[PDB]
Amino acid sequence: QASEEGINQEKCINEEYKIWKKNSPFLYDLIITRALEWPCMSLQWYPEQQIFAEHGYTEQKMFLGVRADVGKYLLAVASIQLPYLNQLRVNISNLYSHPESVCSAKLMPQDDSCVATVGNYHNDVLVFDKESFESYSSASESPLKPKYRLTKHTQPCTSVCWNFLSKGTLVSGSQDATLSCWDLNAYNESDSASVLKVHISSHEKQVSDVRFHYKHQDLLASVSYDQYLHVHDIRRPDASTKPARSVHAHSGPIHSVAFNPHNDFILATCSTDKTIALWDLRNLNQRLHTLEGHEDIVTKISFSPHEEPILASTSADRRTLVWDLSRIGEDQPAEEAQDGPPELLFMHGGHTSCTIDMDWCPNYNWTMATAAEDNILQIWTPSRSIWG
Amino acid sequence: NVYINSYDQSSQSKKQNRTTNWRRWLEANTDIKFFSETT
Amino acid sequence: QVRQFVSPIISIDNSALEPFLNRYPASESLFPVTEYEYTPWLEFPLLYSSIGKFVRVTIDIKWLNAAINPRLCRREIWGTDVYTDDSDIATILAHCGCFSLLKPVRKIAVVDLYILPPLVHYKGTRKNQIESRSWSSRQDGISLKIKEVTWKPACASIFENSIHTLTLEERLQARLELSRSSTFK
């Protein structure tokens, strides 16, 4: 009896598939679909780029952490071909086995060689460097060992974030509802705890996201399952127990928060309440706006590093929505109200299961890469016509 | 699988209209820190 | 500089029906007499003996679609704010302004309707792009008026959500298993 529902559901998943596949040549200017070996838990675009002008493309790089199986937890680097304007394959390589799970693997902005990795299976943060990757040999039987082991938490950490300006400053929010700001240039071989700059207990339920300001050392935000946003400044003395602010942002467990890279005043917040909230720091009594359109849990969100009014959101209904926020308050015809509010811009659904995560390629405009639960990678950019 | 189709002040002004309309719509040591960071 | 015309206002005086709407008190009009499951082939009986009480209809999600429901296009509705008991209840909802025809709905509806004596005249007026017709002769059924509309907080459980209750990695491990045997290409 439950079969019937499951098989129908699988079939309309397939349905959405080739109904996206069928009309692709009228929607996108680029599509690269890659069936990697393994489920890719995360992706992060690499800011260094090769330009083969005579050959006629560019290659960007990607860092993946995948699972081969249970306990087989690995990392890899990919090269990605983008076509050239000014005058075609996805290559996997650099595969190194990890000691334990990866849920979030963040690389330091001003130095690619370092990657802070944590997973849902351990409360230790493992930070890897040049030598750890380059001393590894795929012929060896053992995995890598990171540059450092950072441990203050007692539950696994959910995510991390480097400081974009403060050199070698990191944060780690965990499942035991605590925060930790870390400083690697303050190591001691005798004191692995000297890396511990601050530890905070402001949150009340398991933290889902902690993340720094794009242009500021001392500003970060934390969001937790108790439906609360907390604003932290680390150079506060009372910050170990008192957050800078605490706001009731949503009515469901918050999943993620994104900071506007261009503008230091806007942040975005997603929850299982299928609604996306905006926030401005001079008026925190008030939800800045609310974007509708997902009809089940939204999981994760991100701004565009080229234009700020473009916001991307991913959800459990197998869609990713792109919003151009320059359309607040605008008029829309009667038939134009079908697809949603006019500030909705684009909607991509080429996947077939819960999209794991996204990332913008910062070297090309309008392009994004998404990894999904069905072992699929998607590199896609819409046509000019919708935004040109 | 690869699909390829071979074929600015507007974006900035749309950004600015966003800022303007949205700000027109809009109108503790935390405020102290923020107002230190504001312009 | 274009001329702007304003379509008129529409006023509704259900003041003579007052002795009937209030025949039975509150706290004693809690349970509808009978309950029906809407389908485009539903026909109420004659309900003369229970004037002044209410009935409960239950409409599914598919029925509120201008593409699935065939009765929605024939425009079978007579009256304004009090309708003959021949009228199609979906069209009553969509004309009394409880949903929109252009946007598709995603919940189950539970409607509660009054039972009212026949009227001398049924006036037809255009609202929400639904032009209910008029009946000037003598009706032979009774009349219905919406008492209240209640939407279902959960209508159906999409299986990708029931599996969304499971943890990512755990459900992901069963994913790998299915990928193994698969018995076909």
Curated annotation (Swiss-Prot), chain A:
Keywords, ordered alphabetically: Chromatin regulator, Nucleus, Repeat, Transcription, Transcription regulation, WD repeat
Pfam families, per the entry: CAF1C_H4-bd, WD40
Cellular component, GO annotation: cytoplasm; cytosol; nucleus; Rpd3L complex; Rpd3L-Expanded complex; Rpd3S complex
SUPFAM superfamilies: WD40 repeat-like (SSF50978)
Principal location: nucleus
Cysteine pairs bridged by disulfides in the record: none
GO biological process, one term: chromatin remodeling
Gene Ontology MF terms in the entry: H3-H4 histone complex chaperone activity; histone binding
Localisation: Nucleus
Residue stretches of each WD repeat: 97-129, 152-183, 202-233, 249-280, 293-324, 350-381
Top-level lineage group: Eukaryota
Function of the protein: Has a role in chromatin assembly and chromosome segregation. Involved in the deacetylation of histones.
Subunit description: Heterotetramer of alp13, clr6, prw1 and pst2.
Family: Belongs to the WD repeat HIR1 family.
Protein name: RbAp48-related WD40 repeat-containing protein prw1
The species this protein was found in: Schizosaccharomyces pombe (strain 972 / ATCC 24843) (Fission yeast)
Lineage: Eukaryota, Fungi, Dikarya, Ascomycota, Taphrinomycotina
From Swiss-Prot, chain B:
Highest rank taxon of the organism: Eukaryota
Transmembrane segments: none
Organism: Schizosaccharomyces pombe (strain 972 / ATCC 24843)
Location in or out of the cell: Nucleus
Segment of the intact protein contained: 1095 to 1146 of 1154
Protein name: Paired amphipathic helix protein pst3
UniProtKB/Swiss-Prot annotation, chain C:
Protein location: Nucleus
Chief localisation class: nucleus
GO CC, any one term: Rpd3L complex
GO process terms (BP): transcription initiation-coupled chromatin remodeling
Residues that span the membrane, as ranges: none
Signal peptide: none
Keywords: Chromatin regulator, Nucleus, Repressor, Transcription, Transcription regulation
Keyword Transcription regulation: yes
Keyword Membrane: no
Organism superkingdom: Eukaryota
Function: Component of the RPD3C(L) histone deacetylase complex (HDAC) responsible for the deacetylation of lysine residues on the N-terminal part of the core histones (H2A, H2B, H3 and H4). Histone deacetylation gives a tag for epigenetic repression and plays an important role in transcriptional regulation, cell cycle progression and developmental events.
Subunit text: Component of the RPD3C(L) complex.
Family: Belongs to the RXT3 family.
Descriptive protein name: Transcriptional regulatory protein rxt3
Native organism: Schizosaccharomyces pombe (strain 972 / ATCC 24843)
Taxon lineage: Eukaryota, Fungi, Dikarya, Ascomycota, Taphrinomycotina
Positions spanned in the full protein: 166 to 350 of 351
